[PDB]
Design a protein around this nucleic acid. Structure first.
Ligand SMILES: [K+]
Ligand SMILES: [Mg+2]
Ligand SMILES: [Mg+2]
Ligand SMILES: [Mg+2]
Ligand SMILES: [Mg+2]
Length: 222
RNA sequence: CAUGGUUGUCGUCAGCUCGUGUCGUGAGAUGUUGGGUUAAGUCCCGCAACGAGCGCAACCCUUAUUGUUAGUUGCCAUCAUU
């Protein structure tokens, strides 16, 4: 990836000076107009490392979970994960999604079962009220679990956009010892993430850029 | 004031809990809280919670209109008689 690509995407922007994290000074270039500037040179080195790391994971057939509920990142992570054939969570991370994976499988089973009933034809013999409710049930399960409906096992790697926003997701990864590759901003904590990617969390183009690079790494590994 | 069974009572009030997960050294907590909404823990939304159970509601009886099958021991409009 190119430094010009990053600059055009606006990756270099950070959050306000006051809201930074001191641990991020390792990756900060300078502060302009009261906002910190990520060092895009370190960004290039680190994005290359993460691309290689994601490639290594894919070469083992490992499962990748693309997580982001930021308004900017939700749609982008969905598309890239689908394109890479890996699973995504873009709306809201349910507590216990992984640590309570056993319980979640029952909601996934509910979602699969309700889909079959429609195709099966049970919906035709349903007394209106029932079919209405069942549709509503599905709409929510798809809304929450839809992106990981078919995930076979706990992910081997978790990609996270704005871990500070995705607080619960980072915690579950730590509990299960799942390495994390995250778009880290000036206000985030790098110590939590195995693979640090210094990049603005608040730029749609930047989020899509980095997510596409990770998705492409996975595809290439496969 | 050894008990089973039966019953009163708060009160037909909307509550009482459990599984898994998570938080807390621990008793415990979370969910069951919050914004709305409802008669309702009723429902929606949000939420480290996701579900479930006993409740709530519904399924039940009766009452309020009516189609149809039946037409006596019931009914009498159409008819004639008492
Ligand atoms: K519990
Ligand atoms: Mg209570
Ligand atoms: Mg209830
Ligand atoms: Mg809630
Ligand atoms: Mg009842």
């Amino acid at each position: 990836i190119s430094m010009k690509q990053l600059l055009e995407a606006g990756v270099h922007f950070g959050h306000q000076t006051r809201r930074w994290n001191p641990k991020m000074k390792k990756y900060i270039f300078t502060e302009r107009n009261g906002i910190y500037i990520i060092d895009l040179q370190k960004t290039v080195k680190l994005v290359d490392a993460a691309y290689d790391y994601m490639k290594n994971v894919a070469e083992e057939g490992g499962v990748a979970l693309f997580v982001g509920t930021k308004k900017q990142a939700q749609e982008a992570i969905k598309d890239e994960a689908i394109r890479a054939g890996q699973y995504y969570v873009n709306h809201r991370w349910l507590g216990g999604t992984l640590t309570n994976w056993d319980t979640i499988q029952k909601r996934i089973a509910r979602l699969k079962k309700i889909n079959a009933m429609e195709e099966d034809g049970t919906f035709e013999v349903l007394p209106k009220k029932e079919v209405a409710g069942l549709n509503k049930e599905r709409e929510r399960l798809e809304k929450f679990l839809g992106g990981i409906a078919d995930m076979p096992r706990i992910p081997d790697v978790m990609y996270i956009v704005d871990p500070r926003k995705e607080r619960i997701a980072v915690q579950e990864a730590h509990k299960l010892n799942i390495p994390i590759v995250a778009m880290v901003d000036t206000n985030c904590d790098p110590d939590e993430i195995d693979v640090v990617i210094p990049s603005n969390d608040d730029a749609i183009r930047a989020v899509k850029l980095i997510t596409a690079k990770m998705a492409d790494a996975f595809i290439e590994g496969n």
